[PDB]
Every structure is written in C-alpha cells, then in structure tokens.
Symmetry: C2
Subunit: 439 residues, 2 copies
C-alpha cells in the first residue's frame, strides 16, 4: 500500500452520501499485533467521510455491540434532533441519521459515540472516524497543489489482544495508552512528493494531548476545529487537546528526514504516592516525548507560496447574554462538576435564544487541563487565560489549563436540547457535562 496509511475515504456521489456502518468488535492487525477493537466499517480508524456543503448525508448505524451506542456528529452545526446526545441505539438495532451539510462550512470534523457514562471505553476501543467537508477554497492553487493527508492522532493500550480496561485512576485522569498511533499505525513514514503538505489533524484520543512540533520547521495554521482561519498563522508548535482539529501547511525547507513529535506536555494528570504519611495524590508531570511520524522531504523542495488569505470570519451580532461556567474536580472520587453540579439528562442548565449570540466565560478551577466541548453551536474563542486568541476561526473544543478562563462568542444556531462537556471523555462520563436548551 501507500507508505503513509490513511483511512479509506467514502465520498458523496451526486450530492448524496448514503452509507451503512456497523459498530462491531473486529479482529484486525494494529501496530504489528493482532487485536480485537470496536470499529466502524471494520477498520481503525473508521472510514473518512468526505462531503461538500449542501450534500445530503444518510448514515445508517447498526449496533453490533453488547451495549447501547449512538453517534455524535462532532463539530457539525446541525440539529440536535439529528445529532442527538440522548439517543440510545440498543444492541442489534439500527438508526438512520439524515442531515444536509450546512452551506457555510469547511474543515475536518469527526464522528464517535456520545452516551453519558459509556463514551470513554467505546472511544478508547476504537469507535471513531473523520468527516471532511470540502470547500471551494480547496481549489485555490496554494491548497490545490499541496499534498494533502489526514492524521488521526489516537493512542491505545492493549491487554490480552483487546483494549485495556479502565482502572479507577483512568476514570480520574482520562486514559492514555502506550501505543501512540497515527491513523492506527505506529510511527509511519510519510515520503512527501510535494514540497508543500496540507495536513488535516484530529485528536481522537480520550485524554492524551499532542504538543505538535515538526523538527526544523514551523507549521502554518490554516483551519481550527470547525473552519478556516482568515489568513495563515505561523506557529513553532501546535497543541491539540482531545477533540480538537487543525489543518496546517508544511513548507519543506530542504531534503532530509524530519520527525513530527508530540513534545512533553503536562496536563496535570495525577498518580498516588505513599511516602510515609500519605497516600496522597502526586503530579505525573509532563508526558514523555513521542515520535508520531517520520517525514521524508523530496529532492530540492520548493514550497508553494502561502495563500494570502483564506476565509473572512463572519461579523457577529452583539451578544445578548453572558454565562459563567465553572469547572471543578473531586479527584479522589473521580467526580467532575460544572457550577457545582454533575450532569443530569433531565435537568436543563442553560436556556438560550436561537439566532442570538452569547458570551460564555468558562473557568477551570481544577488543577488539570479540561478541554471544553459544546455540541451543535460552533464558537469563536476570544481569549484564554487572559490572552487574546491570535486568529478568528470556528472552534467547538477549547482547552483550559488550571485556573484559566476562556471567553467564547457563541452564536446559537439550531433549536433543541443539546449538551456541553469536558472532552477528556472520562470526565464527561464522570459528571462534567450540562444541558443547553435553545428555543
């Protein structure tokens, strides 16, 4: 096959993507070993769905798991009557999701389960895939002539040929695995044929962070979770928290081998120590550095010029309400809260008005990073930790380090009941989620 493994792509045909996927325990080869994972479409990751604005998507999910499951159309501004976080597909049953791709939309999105209390083991076991919305912007020469690849960043641990079970400590921290994979492959080699690469990046891990850095190279950020930036932004490194996506251009500078690494990052995960008083909780410290892939540059690379502009970000109406959402932890109980409460599917926490804009101030009063995800309604991050964001783009997950406040502009789009939650999925399962009703 191609030196660089990527998930099989399924494209809409004649404006329709009609597909049946089963969620099924699947024996497969992963990182040189045989394992049984939980997969969509018999693969890990699941197939990449590639669509255009205005396409119809008709996806029938068959549940061949021993427990209920569903799909969250993560990042898509569609109706929560379709992207329904309360829906349960029982074992053996099927459900058809049908929606139209919004007109003003582009980027890398993804699909995975969202059923309170069940997300972490299902996601960890392999139930995820990407969804790419292709834009007329892809046709500009600076993007069209780039070599494009999707990188699904997802770690795994195996025990007895199956995904390792969650320990109590995993429920507290969020589970990370020793197999740090790209598209299900262990440190693949990307032998570039063009001098400019266009990399779509997805963090589909339960809890692992990727402090991305390519040796000897900057990255040019061109899209965040849910759409293009207004112009490329040069960065020396790029942190992707669980649930986040980004697209970058890489301009290969000379011939050679360059490692794409996940540099050390301390997200505040904890262990337990008994030193004679004790036991108490003790910081794990920064993650060990990981090589994600080997990037081989072609001979005498001459990268394309960067596009001068991408997409103008919409001018939003003035906001009509400010919300404050405070995140806290009870680490030893592995319980997590928003404004002092755990999730209850019967309780509406926020009531907002469709087509108005809100300001959400999300404050992390815990000691570990918590990435915050809002379904259905993409937002503009204004600032985090008191620092203005250096670009405008749609996001649906925002990372908060201990103590930080994120200020978000939140246009409310589709009416209905939806959720917001921590995207360290264990924390969501263990209570850090609330309900938003838009009317």
């Amino acid at each position: 096959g191609p030196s660089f493994p990527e998930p099989k792509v399924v494209r809409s045909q004649g404006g329709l993507l009609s597909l049946k996927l089963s969620a099924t325990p699947t024996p497969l080869a992963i990182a040189g070993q045989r394992a049984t994972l939980l997969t969509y479409g018999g693969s890990f990751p699941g197939p990449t769905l590639r669509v255009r604005p205005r396409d119809t998507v008709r996806l029938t999910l068959e549940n061949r798991l021993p427990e209920p499951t569903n799909l969250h159309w993560h990042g898509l501004p569609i109706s929560p009557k379709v992207d329904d976080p309360f829906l349960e597909i029982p074992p053996g049953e099927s459900w058809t999701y049908e929606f139209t791709v919004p007109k003003e939309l582009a980027g890398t999105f993804w699909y995975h389960p969202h059923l309170h209390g069940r997300v972490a083991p299902q996601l960890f076991a392999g139930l995820l895939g990407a969804l790419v919305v292709e834009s007329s912007l892809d046709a500009i020469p600076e993007l069209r002539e780039a070599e494009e690849h999707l990188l699904v960043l997802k770690d795994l641990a195996l025990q007895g040929g199956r995904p390792a079970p969650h320990t109590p400590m995993d429920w507290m921290n969020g589970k990370e695995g020793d197999l740090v994979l790209v598209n299900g492959a262990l440190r693949p080699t990307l032998v570039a044929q063009k001098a400019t690469l266009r990399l779509r990046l997805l963090n589909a891990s339960n809890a692992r962070y990727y402090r991305l850095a390519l040796q000897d190279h900057p990255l040019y950020l061109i899209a965040a979770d849910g759409g293009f930036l207004e112009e490329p932004l040069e960065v020396s490194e790029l942190l992707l928290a669980p649930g986040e996506r980004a697209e970058v251009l890489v301009r290969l500078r000379k011939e050679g081998r360059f490692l794409l690494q996940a540099l050390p990052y301390d997200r505040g995960a904890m262990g337990m120590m008994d030193m004679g008083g004790m036991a108490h909780a003790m910081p794990q410290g920064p993650s060990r550095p990981e090589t994600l892939l080997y990037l081989i540059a072609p001979k005498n690379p001459k990268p394309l010029p960067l596009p001068k502009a991408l997409s103008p970000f919409p001018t939003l109406p003035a906001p009509v309400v400010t919300r404050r959402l405070v995140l806290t932890e009870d680490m030893m109980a592995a319980r997590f809260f928003i404004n002092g409460q755990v999730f209850d599917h019967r309780r509406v926490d926020l009531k907002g008005q469709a087509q108005t804009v809100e300001v959400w101030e999300v404050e992390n009063q815990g000691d570990m990073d918590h990435p915050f995800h809002l379904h259905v309604h993409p937002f503009q991050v204004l600032s985090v930790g008191g620092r203005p964001f250096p670009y405008r783009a749609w996001k649906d997950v925002v990372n908060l380090k201990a103590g930080e406040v994120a200020r978000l502009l939140v246009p409310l789009r589709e009416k209905g009941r939806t959720v917001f939650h921590c995207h360290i999925v264990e924390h969501e399962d263990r209570g850090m989620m609330g309900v938003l009703e838009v009317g």
Copy 2:
C-alpha cells in the same frame, strides 16, 4: 391655614415610623365641594411620610373598603416580600408592612394600591400619598435655605358627590378628570417667602400628563423618581408622566405673579367618530392647557446660588443580559400586551440574577404614550427614542412615546417575585404587566 395646602407630614421618631392607616370612604371638602373619596388617613392626598435612610417603617394598613386592597411602596428598593404586588388584604382585615429604609436612598416616593384589575378605580378615587426620604444632602446650604414644598399632581372627576365611574373609553385611554388639582386643591396660591424654592413633584394621576412650565422661568432639575441627579440640570419645561416624580429648584427672578402650567400635551388618547363610514377611532389631540398654581414671588428676590454638585451616580458593573420588552395595544378591546401576552400572576416572564445588571430595551409599538414602571429595582435611563438622557439618576418609571425605544440599565437588587407594568394604570389593569423573578 397656610395659603399653600400640602398634606400633613408624619415623621419617623427615634428612627421609627410606626403608623396605622385605614383605607376608607371619607366624606370631605374638595375644590369647594363635598365629596366622598377613598382615602388613607382620612385625607386626600394621604399623609406624607417623611423618613431617613436606616429608619424602620412599620405601617399597618386596615382595609375599610368593600373590596381587597394593598400597598405598593412605589419607587422603594426594598424586598418584594414586603412590597408584595400579589398580596390581597380582604375587606375588614389589616396587614402590617415592615421594612428598613435603604442606606443609599433619597427622594420623593409614594404609596398607592397595586392589585391587578383594581388599581385604576382605587387610585382615581383618592388612594395615594407621598413618602419622602430625607438625605444628608438636604443640609447643604443651597438646599437647606430653599423654601421646600411638595406638589402632588392628581386630577379628579366627580359625579353625584363621588369619583366618576370608569367608562369603556376610560379603560382604553386611562381616565382623566376635569378637576386638575395640586395637593387636592384647585389652583392654590403659593406665596413664596424665599427667592429659591425646592419643589418635590409627584404625578399621582391615573393617566394625565403634566408638561410643566413656570411662566418666565426655567426649572432646575435636581432629582428624578428615585434619587438626585449628579448636578442640577436647567430645563425650560419638564414632562411628568403618571407615576413619575421630580424635584426642581426655582430661582424667582423678579417680583410678580407667575403661573405654573401644564402645557398642551398629546399622549395619544383616542375618541370615537362616526362621519358616515365609521365609527372609528380618532385622536383626541393635545390636552387643554391647565393652570396648576399661582406663584407669587417675594419682594426683590435674590435666589441662592445653585449647588455645584448633588450626588455622584454609582458606577455600575457591566451588564450580563439584554432583554427586549415590546408594548402593543388592541384599542377597541381595551387590551394591552407585553411581548404579545397579557399579565398572568402564575407565569414568570423574566428570570434574573440578584446583584447583576441587565439592559432592558422597552419598545412602544403602540400609538399612545405608555409609561413603564418596574417595581423593586430602580434603573438608569440610558436613552429614549435614540436620544441619550442628559443626566444620570435613579428612575422607576420611564415614558415612551409611540414608536420609541427606551434603553435602561437595571441592577437587580432584592430577590423574589415582582412585576413591571404600564403606569397608565388602566393599561396595567387591562393586561400590560409581566412578572420578573430575581434569584
């Protein structure tokens, strides 16, 4: 008695105003004729209660009417558990209102009934009195040495020695009467002894407006409904809508007689005409000019200088929500609405958070003036009709002419359930009222 009639004053003693008032049909002399009114304390207007910040008020109201009644402590930022707009005192029963006067408070307030559907006939019949909160600011020489008077502006119509009954047209327009009185007196004479007067003004009419102008003189506005301005504001005239209060300084310029008039004002009241197609509604047009009192200036008047400053207006926290409240009419049905609904005491319309500030945009989409009153939570008028207000002061009633939007800054103070409504009281009785819950 004194040439200028004013209501008898009852002052707090040793920090306590303890008083029993009965609401009772009372035979009395009014404007040269004998009439039976509904009164507090056996007089029309009721007694003026004069208190200081931090005083305790303990007022027992005995209901000697044939229908239920209560008190609204109009303009006072106290608890709606005391100033309770849903409380009914049955005929023959008594209720004791007890509260502390807030520390940061000054001005002319008033008391009158507030029971949905019953306000207009009770108020019209005479149930009202003033409440003055005296400030340490009263001791500055520019105010202390002024000659002070209260002017309760209230019209009346009599039929068979009793207040005239409401007609259907009265419920549509709000009832106005032909006897245009000051402190229950018909065109009294105020023989000034000082060159500077300090006039506290109260519009206690059901619906009549007073476009105030003193012949040959400007007025210096020094307080609005619920407190002092930051500095005096010179005006050539001053419109007081139903429920509004103001305090002005008058600087008598020369010897002579000067009329204080209510100049013609068109509030959009309607009549009915049959001209051969018809009948349809037709504008009443502006009110006829009325003389309110004769003001006689003393010999060689030398007015005091104006105070350079009064009270700095508090710097308010940034608002956390914007509300839009739209006022509309069905004139032929005499029904009045806020956001398309009539009042229902069981239905909460707005839910806000104590100690936050809200922006309320109140929009009059009717054709007649509607003054808008909010209980419990005094507000700062930012603009009306797109015109910035020329001063900062606390108000609790704001007038809106046809089509105008008023933008208010509304700090939410006491917790509990309260109301907001049109202060053309007939319109409140006929539906133009809503419920605010503060938590």
